[PDB]
């Protein structure tokens, strides 16, 4: 009796419900307001996120130019030493620049002393060489006597004896330089924020693990952010905007939870009526509202993290950015729920609903072939091909090849081996040709055929 | 009675109308003449447009080589100073080259003195440093005391004391060098045109807003064009050609307006007959003729601007070029109006007419997803990914990815973060894979399906 | 009566004709032999073609390294002078290297003296500056007085006063250095060929036509090949192979001409029978045999040219290579004539036969849009975009964009103008987005739909 | 009678057979175990394969930096000498560095003396110049007198007179430097493996075969691996894992062979029953089991090779890697055999089975066109186009072009010839446009149509 009318009303559109019981669509206007405010909050956060990331990266580039002898932009991957004299000069240049920093640097840096290892108390720079405990290497007689246990020896340099360093080249594992520098991110002032205090931990590595006559040289930094002690800025909204976002998301969450509860109660009543199928029950679950509550939770968590970062209780910019960006994407996607009511505007969702199961079953069979190719390429071609170094990189290369991207350069990276390793080159030819042909012309064609057949069904 | 015959005649083809009432198709021959003359005028204008653009750009490159110490082509994005000595040397090199310009430069330049700020009367070069009013920075004690108000102090150099410049490095915001140079674009002589007089305003910036120990250095120019005073060229068509273009476009406009008026009158009579639907009225509007009158207006405006530029009353080359190029494109497109009469030649337009509404409705749903991805990528990945720096650049990157372009390099730009920021790298993996899969395999497939289904309908 | 049987036999396959009248298929075996021999001849010619091209290009690169001060590989497009001292040094370096060539060069070169202009009798090198007859340039007073007539003044240098060169910088149009060198292409010995004598005409240009303060510097060569005088090589097939190719092509031509004549006679008889439609007559014309006779003519012409080049009567390697390569492609394509008899192997040709007319009609409408875009892009974007410099380059860029290639870099080349010329940048955005959308999603889709519909018809 | 039931059981699924006769599916669990263990073995082998390849390549790069004067990374393709003084300096630098190696090198190398040619007994380095027996070259008189027989003259250098080298430049064919160095691959210690002893044979070539004034310089190495004599590593699983892989593959092979024999016997019985068609017999052959036995043979061979390499009996890393990688790919693909039983999961295989014959027939016709284009492009464009140098490279370029990849750069590589060789440039335009249009829009469309029509059939 009334159950039929109740269900019919439960599955009606906002305009239909307004016609029926004069219900005002507050959820829709809330969604529009949410899109606006969440996007604005994301951009406002992005300002400070960019400030932090830029400070870290620019300081690291400046360190590379200051401490690496003969360094130039774009040389990171090939920068290396090849003679004993070059290596000694690089090490001494790094240490001398560390000692001269106050007089030459464009930035203002403070020294850090002591702390844990590798620094002794009062020491600012640690210069450590690591070598085998016993190494006797005699290629002339085709012999060696090695105790592979690593011994670390190093020199402590106080900021304003290291020149007596003697490297044990034949059994040298690596050389490292460790030091910390303190600086202040003044640019924050442009965003009406109090500058933070940064500590950069700088590691310079001269790596000899390959014992190949080529020692690559690299510099890396780790940044630690902390609040400064009683700072002063002459004449030192966002909080209220964050509170507004929180209120909007809370109201949206409450309305969506109420709708889900109403749907659950109606589902229970209908099941009781029928009894007097899991899918027939899930038909009462509004997936869009589950997405909306997930988005609200994400947005509130991101806003709380953002408030904490602004208050200087936290410094996890990356997590906050990921939370807020994902929530913004979900908020933008959420409004399709209201287009679902009209067939002329619901082609994408209607087709995906029919296509997805067969697509998943197809992927079941395609994935094992894809993984076989991934592992084979990674292990066989990785030592020779710059695009096959790692499994994730192999997956990227194969996925791009399926889409027709970067094909000729992939083929050409192997041309160097046609004269050196002919068998590997021939294998790479067969591998690439077979993969491209199979996946572009057979697999992808059938995938698209499944999707277009589903569309033909729903149309 | 006669209304049926009149409407049938009104909807007939040029050949059919010639058969019926012996009407000569002057509009079609006018369209052909218009294509020829408008294209020729565009090319002729392009000659002088190229001359102007080349003068500006070549002078700017020469300035970069003259005034930037150690500059080389292709280094614009990374050119920077890293030590106090480097910065002082760059500043003094720029000023010294400015003073030596008459003796060393291959071009002939005249100095400009006085005028508004930043130059005092009689001064040719302004060397200005901008720093915080009060800056006390103490990273050693984790303290600072800042009044962020910017103070500008600068030295005036008369063209043929600046060597005493002392930079306040710890609170320095930036350094700028401003000067103006006058020159003459002699190359115009090859196009039988009188050379113009150019003033180049040159700004060299040493930017320290990030306070990161790396100060990027850049040079920019702004060009002002003016007529020279009583020039003399020994033995100093285009005007007549412009007048011909104007006459052709005016006649085309008159004929198209007459046709539109006739259609409007016939529409009114038919509506009156029926009365004794907005679409049923718009059926009488020839959209091709609206396009043609728009193209005629654009062409006449562009020709008037071109005449003014040739007379030296205007120098807005870019606006003129845009007007004339758009009008040329529209003129070329306009002749499809006559192919519309024959079905075997009207596949594209006939199919678009049926497909466009459903395509627009589909875009309604796709656009919110696209914008969500744009904002998320711009804010989360922009600090780390060179292709996500700006919203327009993000849109370009995503649009290219949809078309399969530049995929692997997009993936590879993030490989540097796999060791530094693992969470951001993982997010970028999920973001790129999900976007590419969704848009290439689901969205684009259904878009093409809509278009091909419309074609199946009209065929 | 007999006419039906005669026609049925005339349209039968080689196996069917062998069954009917025991006819041996000599044309087919001739085609196979032709493929083999023509391909082999192409490769054999390619050996000597490569030798000639390599000699020219390697000599030109060596000249660039010898005569251009500070030249390095890959700098051709940006190599330029920027100060008077740099230009003087480059000019004097080129002349000094010309004079020192016998002592420093790795190649063996002989000087050429006299001849026509610009060299006087006995002169090996001509150093010429071209300037305006009267040039008074006064940017300070915004005035000039120019007689644009070009005066050429130049110095003659005898191979082993030019140091007194005074350049008129303010009215200088360009500077050129002309000289000729003779050398011998010894590498020909590896191919059992007598070396040729080469004369390289070398032109070095310092171009100041833009009067922009930047003078680009370039070097170009023209090679003239001649037989040497009574050469001697101790112990100094291909001719017989060329004769064999000629005989094979002649026999194929004769058989195809006989077949065409037989078809023409049968066509005339059938028309006479019917009389007691142009297409109904062209149905008797074997297009494959027209292609075969064209290929035979091309092959014979190429072989005669190759024999002449080997005999040293000709040196037009490029024309011979084009003739032989085209003939090889046509010979390879010609064997599809025999697959046309079997439907399971004739899908491509059968479908093209049905699709081509509608494709041509579609192209009629698409071409005007494409040309409008070409002209608009060439004139509006060419001064700003490296990929739009020339009309052919614009066509290449747009054709590649239609196929999804190089999209993001096309967008990115304009990002530099977003700050300098905002209006041009906005126009480029609209231009690229509209072109890509229209052509990839609407035009190409309908093109493929036409082809697949034709296939659906023939299947 | 029983034959029908026997055949029906023979063609049932694992679950169906378990229902029928309670058969435990040991082959399927064996396949899962095989996937796991084979993939793990491949990765474990990849560790040592990477160690070997890295040692070889890093040593070669170090040699290039040590022995090539003025060498820098990325200069391999253009590195060349252009004056006699440069060539002498490069030769003497290489020899001097060879003599100074113990004092300057970061690696530890031992000299090799004597052996076969080109070294005499006691000699470590051979410096050999090769020139024509008689060369008189007179370009001034357009004459030459050559005996092309090559004479080799060379100097022996003992490791710690070559300075008196006099090069016969006008008839010089090339110069080579040969020497061998011994070293130890210590990095193996990180993988708990005993280091191997490497001998690097180093060849430095200064090539003058073109006699063009440009002499390219290159360095190449060949590595020979051997076990060292009585090495000692303080405290010097994989064997047991290899044995486990062998056992698993052997059991899988036995089960698959038993299944194939059972199928053969059933086939014979059915044929005997019918007698009282080759395809009707091949219907009894399980192709998946043939694939599985092939994979088992490959895996066992690869494992035996891996054990031999670990024992130091072999050093063929490339062959072992190819065997194991191919076997891993086949093992991953093999599990689709069990998905073949379910139609919803068998779309790919079911469609391929129907599409493959028509695809092969289509390829018959397409291949001759493709080969014609390959040969034409290789011979005509190869001397001018970097992507057409070799036939394999031409095939890669054309295959990539079909897939839309690298189009604009292919067009742009020819733009340099538009001014030099206009006829070749025009031919390249026609060649590229025709190939791309024909193959992308006609051939590929029909290929995809065949595949999708087969899918339409099986669905
Ligand atoms: C009945 C249905 C059942 C389910 C259907 C079948 C499911 C299909 C599963 C697909 C699996 C494909 C294999 C990918 C993994 C291979 C690469 C890999 O592991 O990377 C190594 C990397 C790490 O390896 P690495 O490179 O760091 O280490 C290599 C080792 N060294 C460094 C020592 C050399 O792992 C990853 O982080 C995973 C990256 C791959 C992820 C790509 C898969 C897609 C992700 C989801 C987005 C798509 C959503 C689409 C939805 C949109 C529309 C709604
Ligand atoms: C019932 C039907 C209703 C309508 C149907 C639905 C309409 C669909 C609307 C599409 C909108 C898609 C979103 C694009 C905007 C995102 C990018 C953006 O805003 O850029 C930022 C830029 C500016 O941002 P920015 O990068 O300068 O600033 C970033 C901020 N900083 C610098 C501080 C880091 O804005 C633009 O200039 C817009 C560029 C995007 C334009 C692309 C859209 C297409 C243009 C029209 C051409 C296509 C015509 C096709 C017709 C051919 C066939 C007839
Ligand atoms: C009824 C059916 C009958 C059969 C149907 C028709 C069969 C179709 C045959 C295709 C042939 C196509 C021509 C390619 C050869 C041209 C290039 C060449 O030879 O290279 C030169 C190279 C060597 O040349 P080079 O470049 O080293 O030498 C040039 C000379 N110098 C150096 C002096 C300048 O040869 C090769 O190594 C071959 C490379 C091409 C291989 C590509 C073909 C595909 C390989 C198989 C993988 C695909 C499997 C797909 C299955 C997946 C799904 C199940
Ligand atoms: C994201 C959940 C969508 C659920 C599909 C049903 C549409 C009402
Ligand atoms: C909704 C998940 C929130 C995760 C926050 C964790 C921050 C360390
Ligand atoms: C550009 C306007 C086209 C209007 C479509 C109707 C064709 C007669
Ligand atoms: C038809 C629009 C003309 C715009 C001209 C404006 C130039 C400043
Ligand atoms: C290349 C000419 C082909 C002619 C088509 C008819 C096929 C017998
Ligand atoms: C790889 C062999 C597959 C054989 C096709 C038949 C499937 C049972």
Q: Assess whether C244 and C199 both reside in one domain.
A: no
Residue D111 lies in a domain: yes
Q: Do B412 and A404 touch (CB under 8 A)?
A: no
Within B54-115, strands assigned E span: 80-81, 110-111
The residue with tokens 């298929």 is: C25
- How far does the centroid of ligand 6 lie from the alpha carbon of residue B270, in Å? 20
Q: At residue B192, what are phi and psi to the nearest 5 degrees?
A: 60, 40
Q: Whole-angstrom Cα distance, residue B244 to residue B46? A: 18
Q: Whole-angstrom Cα distance, residue B32 to residue A271? A: 74
Residues in chain C: 459
Q: Whose CA is nearest to atom 7 of ligand 8?
A: C340
Q: Whole-angstrom Cα distance, residue C426 to residue D72? A: 42
CB C94 within 8 A of CB C67: yes
Residue C137 lies in a domain: yes
Residue D251 lies in a domain: yes
Q: Assess whether D72 and D201 both reside in one domain.
A: yes
Q: Assess whether B203 and B320 both reside in one domain.
A: no
Residue A57 lies in a domain: no
Domain span at residue D284 reads: 2-50+237-341
Q: Whole-angstrom Cα distance, residue B428 to residue D181? A: 47
- Residue that terminates a domain, selected from D174, D192, D226: D226
Q: Do C214 and B58 touch (CB under 8 A)?
A: yes
Contacts 24+ apart (CB under 8 A), D304-310: D304/D246, D306/D41, D306/D45, D306/D242, D307/D239, D307/D242, D309/D48, D310/D48, D310/D193, D310/D238, D310/D239
Q: Assess whether A174 and A285 both reside in one domain.
A: no
| Assigned token pair, B411 | 């993936």
**HSE value, Cβ hemisphere, 13 Å, CA-based, for D42:** 31
Q: At residue C34, what are phi and psi to the nearest 5 degrees?
A: -65, -45
Q: Assess whether B243 and B325 both reside in one domain.
A: yes
| Assigned token pair, D150 | 């090559």
Q: Is the CB of A36 under 6 A from ligand 5?
A: no
CA separation (Å) from D339 to C7, D260, D347? 55, 19, 10
- How far does the centroid of ligand 8 lie from the alpha carbon of residue D437, in Å? 19
Q: Do C322 and D415 touch (CB under 8 A)?
A: no
- Residue that terminates a domain, selected from D341, D367, D397: D341
- Find the distance separating the first CA and the last CA of chain D, reported in whole Å: 34
Q: Which residue of C has its CA nearest to D415?
A: C393
Q: Whole-angstrom Cα distance, residue A84 to residue A213? A: 10
Residue B232 lies in a domain: no
Q: Whose CA is nearest to atom 35 of ligand 2?
A: B392
Residues of A in contact with D351 (CB under 8 A): 442, 446
Site from B139, B400, B420, B447 to mutate, A interface, most A CB atoms within 10 angstroms = B139
Residue B158 lies in a domain: yes
Under DSSP, is residue B233 helix (H, G, I), strand (E, B) or coil?
strand
Distance from the Cα of residue C340 to its chain's centroid: 33
Q: Assess whether A45 and A166 both reside in one domain.
A: no
Q: At residue B112, what are phi and psi to the nearest 5 degrees?
A: -115, 135
CB B318 within 8 A of CB C379: no
Q: Whole-angstrom Cα distance, residue C215 to residue C80? A: 5
Q: Whole-angstrom Cα distance, residue D362 to residue C348? A: 8
Residue A424, C-beta contacts closer than 8 angstroms, at least 6 positions apart:
A380, A381, A384, A414, A417, D318, D321, D322
- Find the distance separating the first CA and the last CA of chain B, reported in whole Å: 34
Q: Whole-angstrom Cα distance, residue D365 to residue B414? A: 44
What is the CB < 6 Å shell around ligand 3? A 429-430, 433-434, 437-438; D 360-361, 363-364, 367, 370-371, 374, 390-393, 395
- How far does the centroid of ligand 3 lie from the alpha carbon of residue C200, in Å? 41
Distance from the Cα of residue B323 to its chain's centroid: 12
Q: Assess whether C11 and C75 both reside in one domain.
A: no
Residues of A in contact with D393 (CB under 8 A): 412, 415
Q: Whose CA is nearest to atom 44 of ligand 1?
A: B433
Under DSSP, is residue B204 helix (H, G, I), strand (E, B) or coil?
strand
Q: Whose CA is nearest to atom 7 of ligand 4?
A: A340
- Residue that terminates a domain, selected from D341, D365, D386: D341
Under DSSP, is residue C314 helix (H, G, I), strand (E, B) or coil?
coil
- How far does the centroid of ligand 3 lie from the alpha carbon of residue D373, in Å? 13
Under DSSP, is residue D172 helix (H, G, I), strand (E, B) or coil?
strand
DSSP B292-339: HHHHHHHHHHHHHHHHHHHTTS---HHHHHHHHHHHHHHHHHHTHHHH
Q: Assess whether A378 and A308 both reside in one domain.
A: no
Of B36, B49, B53, B38, whose CA–CA distance to B327 is shortest?
B38
The residue with tokens 């005629």 is: B296
Q: Whole-angstrom Cα distance, residue B109 to residue C137? A: 10
CB D182 within 8 A of CB D221: no
From D377, D383, D395, D398, the mutation candidate for ligand 3 (largest count of ligand atoms within 8 A of CB) is: D395
CB D449 within 8 A of CB C452: yes
| Assigned token pair, B85 | 């000595």
- How far does the centroid of ligand 8 lie from the alpha carbon of residue C288, in Å? 6
| Assigned token pair, D294 | 């092939």
Based on its alpha-carbon atoms, the radius of gyration of chain B, rounded to whole angstroms, reads 31
Alpha helices (H) along D68-191: 84-104
Contacts 24+ apart (CB under 8 A), C23-31: C26/C255, C27/C252, C27/C255, C27/C256, C27/C259, C28/C338, C30/C248, C30/C251, C30/C252, C30/C255, C31/C252, C31/C292, C31/C331, C31/C334, C31/C335, C31/C338
Q: Which ligand is nearest to the CA of A13?
A: 4
Q: Assess whether D156 and D298 both reside in one domain.
A: no
Question: If DSSP states are collapsed to H, E and C, what string results for chain A?
Answer: CHHHHHHHHHCCCHHHHHHHHCCCCHHHHHHHHHHHHHHHHHHHHHHHHHHHHHHHHHHHHHHHHHHCCCCCCCCCCCCEECEHHHHHHHHHHHHHHHHHHHHHECCCCEECCCCCCCCCCCCCEEEEEEEEEEEEEECCCCEEEEEEEEEEEEEEECCCCHHHCCCCHHHEEEEEEEEEEEEECHHHHHHCCCCCEEEEEEEEEEECCCCCCCEEEEEEEEEEEECCCCCEECCCCHHHHHHHHHHHHHHHHHHHHHHHHHHHHHHHHHHHHHHCCHHHHHCCCCHHHHHHHHHHHHHHHHHHHHHHHHCCCCCCHHHHHHHHHHHHHHHHHHCHHHHCCCHHHCHHHHHHHHHHHHHHHHHHHHHHHHHHHHHHHHHHHCCCCHHHCCHHHHHHHHHHHHCCCCHHHHHHCCCCHHHHCHHHHHHHHHHHHHHHHHHHHHHHHHHHHHHHHHHHHHC
Kindly state the helix (H) or strand (E) to which residue B154 belongs, with its residue range.
strand B143-157
Number of domains, chain D? 3
Q: Which residue of C has its CA nearest to B103?
A: C84
Quote the minimal CA–CA distance from C146 to chain D in Å.
32
- Beta bridge partner(s), residue B157: B125
CB C181 within 8 A of CB C112: yes
Residues of C in contact with D366 (CB under 8 A): 348
Q: Would you say the C-alpha torsion C1, C7, C10, C13 has a positive or negative sign? A: negative
- How was this structure determined? It was done by cryo-EM
* Torsion (CA) A275, A280, A284, A290 in degrees, nearest 10: 130
Residue B232, C-beta contacts closer than 8 angstroms, at least 6 positions apart:
C144, C145, C146
- CB-nearest partner of A182 from B139, B208, B405: B139
Residue B255, C-beta contacts closer than 8 angstroms, at least 6 positions apart:
B26, B27, B30
Q: At residue D106, what are phi and psi to the nearest 5 degrees?
A: -75, -25
CB A442 within 8 A of CB D348: yes
Q: At residue D335, what are phi and psi to the nearest 5 degrees?
A: -75, -10
Q: Which residues of B419-438 are buried (b: 16+ CB within 10 A; e: fewer)?
A: eebeebbebbbebbeebbeb
Q: Assess whether D286 and D200 both reside in one domain.
A: no
- CB-nearest partner of D345 from A145, A361, A443: A361
Kindly state the helix (H) or strand (E) to which residue B137 belongs, with its residue range.
strand B125-138
What is the CB < 6 Å shell around ligand 2? B 360-361, 363-364, 367, 370-371, 374, 390-393, 395; C 429-430, 433-434, 437-438
- CB-nearest partner of B404 from A74, A229, A404: A404
- CB-nearest partner of B339 from C214, C358, C364: C364
Distance from the Cα of residue C237 to its chain's centroid: 30
- How far does the centroid of ligand 1 lie from the alpha carbon of residue A366, in Å? 13
Q: At residue A373, what are phi and psi to the nearest 5 degrees?
A: -65, -40
- Beta bridge partner(s), residue A217: A206
Q: Whole-angstrom Cα distance, residue D226 to residue A142? A: 9
| Assigned token pair, D179 | 């020497």
Compute how many other C-beta atoms are within 10 angstroms of the C-beta atom of residue D239. 11
- How far does the centroid of ligand 3 lie from the alpha carbon of residue A430, in Å? 9
Q: At residue A345, what are phi and psi to the nearest 5 degrees?
A: -110, 5
Q: Which residue of A has its CA nearest to D394?
A: A408
Q: Assess whether B84 and B175 both reside in one domain.
A: yes
Q: Assess whether B204 and B268 both reside in one domain.
A: no
Based on its alpha-carbon atoms, the radius of gyration of chain D, rounded to whole angstroms, reads 31
Site from B446, B452, B457 to mutate, A interface, most A CB atoms within 10 angstroms = B446
Residues of D in contact with A423 (CB under 8 A): 318-319, 322
Q: Whole-angstrom Cα distance, residue B390 to residue A13? A: 38
Residue C378, C-beta contacts closer than 8 angstroms, at least 6 positions apart:
B46, C388, C390, C391, C394
Residue A319 Cα: closest atom of ligand 5:
7
- CB-nearest partner of D451 from A384, A427, A445: A445
Residue D113, C-beta contacts closer than 8 angstroms, at least 6 positions apart:
D119, D121, D122, D123, D124, D158, D159
Residue C77 lies in a domain: yes
Residues of C in contact with B104 (CB under 8 A): 83-85
Residue B318 lies in a domain: yes
Of B167, B180, B165, B175, whose CA–CA distance to B217 is shortest?
B175
Q: Which ligand is nearest to the CA of B351?
A: 6
CB A210 within 8 A of CB D58: yes
| Assigned token pair, C283 | 């149905």
Q: Whole-angstrom Cα distance, residue A421 to residue A416? A: 9
Q: Is the CB of B341 under 6 A from ligand 6?
A: no
* Torsion (CA) B296, B300, B303, B305 in degrees, nearest 10: -130
Residues of B in contact with C358 (CB under 8 A): 344, 347
Alpha helices (H) along D68-181: 84-104
Kindly state the helix (H) or strand (E) to which residue B37 belongs, with its residue range.
helix B26-67
Of D374, D402, D387, D400, whose CA–CA distance to C332 is shortest?
D374
CB D38 within 8 A of CB D328: yes
Quote the minimal CA–CA distance from D116 to chain C in Å.
28
Q: Whole-angstrom Cα distance, residue D425 to residue D433? A: 12
Of A150, A207, A198, A148, whose CA–CA distance to A177 is shortest?
A207
The residues after which chain C has a C–N gap greater than 2.5 Å are 160, 236, 276
The residue with tokens 């054990």 is: D307
Q: Which residue of D has its CA nearest to A369?
A: D333
Q: Do B421 and A318 touch (CB under 8 A)?
A: yes
Q: Whole-angstrom Cα distance, residue A207 to residue D64? A: 19
Resolution given for this structure, in angstroms: 2.1
Residue D364 Cα: closest atom of ligand 3:
6
CB A361 within 8 A of CB B415: no
**HSE value, Cβ hemisphere, 13 Å, CA-based, for D36:** 9
Q: Whole-angstrom Cα distance, residue A413 to residue D165? A: 39
The residues after which chain D has a C–N gap greater than 2.5 Å are 160, 236, 276
Q: Which chains touch D (3 or more CB pairs under 8 A)?
A: A, C
The residue with tokens 């090559």 is: D150
Residues of C in contact with B455 (CB under 8 A): 445-446, 449
Residue A291 Cα: closest atom of ligand 4:
1
Distance from the Cα of residue C190 to its chain's centroid: 27
Under DSSP, is residue D296 helix (H, G, I), strand (E, B) or coil?
helix
Q: Which ligand is nearest to the CA of B304?
A: 7
Residues of A in contact with B137 (CB under 8 A): 108, 184, 186
Of B50, B51, B49, B66, whose CA–CA distance to B186 is shortest?
B51
Q: Which residue of C has its CA nearest to B187?
A: C210
Q: Do C406 and D405 touch (CB under 8 A)?
A: no
Q: Whose CA is nearest to atom 39 of ligand 3?
A: D392
- Beta bridge partner(s), residue C217: C206
CB D131 within 8 A of CB D150: yes
| Assigned token pair, C359 | 């494709």
| Assigned token pair, B317 | 């080359």
Q: At residue A252, what are phi and psi to the nearest 5 degrees?
A: -60, -45
- How far does the centroid of ligand 8 lie from the alpha carbon of residue C337, in Å? 7
């Amino acid at each position: 009796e009334d159950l039929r009318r109740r269900l019919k009303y439960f599955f009606m559109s906002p305009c239909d419900k307004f016609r029926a019981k004069g219900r005002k669509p507050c959820k829709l206007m809330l969604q529009v307001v949410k899109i606006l405010v969440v996007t604005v909050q994301l951009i406002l956060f992005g300002l400070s996120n960019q400030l932090a990331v830029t400070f870290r990266e620019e300081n690291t580039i400046a360190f590379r130019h200051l401490f690496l002898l003969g360094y130039s932009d774009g040389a990171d991957d090939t920068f290396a030493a090849y003679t004993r004299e070059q290596l000694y000069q690089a090490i001494f240049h790094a240490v001398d620049q560390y000692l001269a920093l106050p007089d030459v640097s464009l930035g203002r840096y403070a020294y850090v002393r002591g702390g844990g290892d590798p620094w002794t108390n009062g020491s600012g720079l640690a210069l450590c060489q690591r070598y085998y405990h016993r190494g006797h290497v005699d290629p002339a007689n085709d012999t060696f006597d090695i105790d592979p246990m690593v011994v670390t020896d190093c020199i402590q340099v106080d900021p304003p004896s290291y020149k007596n360093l003697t490297l044990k080249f034949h059994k040298l594992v690596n050389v490292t330089i460790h030091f910390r520098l303190k600086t202040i991110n003044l640019q924050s002032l442009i965003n009406n924020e109090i500058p933070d205090c940064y500590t950069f931990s700088v590691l310079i590595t001269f790596d000899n693990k390959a014992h190949s006559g080529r020692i690559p040289i690299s510099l890396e930094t780790q940044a630690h952010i902390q609040e400064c002690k009683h700072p002063s800025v002459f004449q030192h909204f966002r909080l209220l905007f964050d509170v507004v976002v929180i209120l909007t998301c809370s109201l949206s969450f409450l309305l969506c939870a109420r709708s889900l509860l109403r749907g659950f109660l109606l589902q229970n009543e209908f099941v009781g009526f029928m009894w007097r199928s899991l899918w027939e029950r899930l038909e009462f679950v509004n997936g869009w509202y589950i997405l909306l509550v997930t988005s609200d939770v994400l947005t509130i968590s991101g806003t709380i993290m953002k408030i904490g970062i602004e208050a200087k209780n936290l410094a996890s910019y990356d997590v906050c950015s990921i939370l807020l960006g994902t929530s913004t994407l979900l908020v933008w996607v959420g409004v399709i729920r209201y287009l679902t009511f009209f067939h002329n505007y619901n082609i994408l969702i209607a087709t995906l609903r029919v296509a997805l199961p067969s697509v998943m079953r197809f992927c079941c069979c395609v994935a094992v072939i894809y993984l076989g190719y991934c592992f084979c390429g990674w292990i066989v071609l990785g030592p020779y091909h710059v695009k096959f170094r790692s499994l994730s990189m192999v997956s990227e290369c194969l996925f791009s090849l399926i889409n027709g991207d970067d094909m000729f350069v992939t083929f050409a990276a192997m041309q160097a081996q046609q004269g050196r390793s002919s068998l590997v080159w021939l294998f790479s030819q067969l591998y690439l040709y077979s993969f491209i042909s199979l996946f572009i012309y057979m697999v992808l064609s059938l995938f698209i055929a499944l999707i277009t057949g589903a569309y033909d069904t729903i149309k």
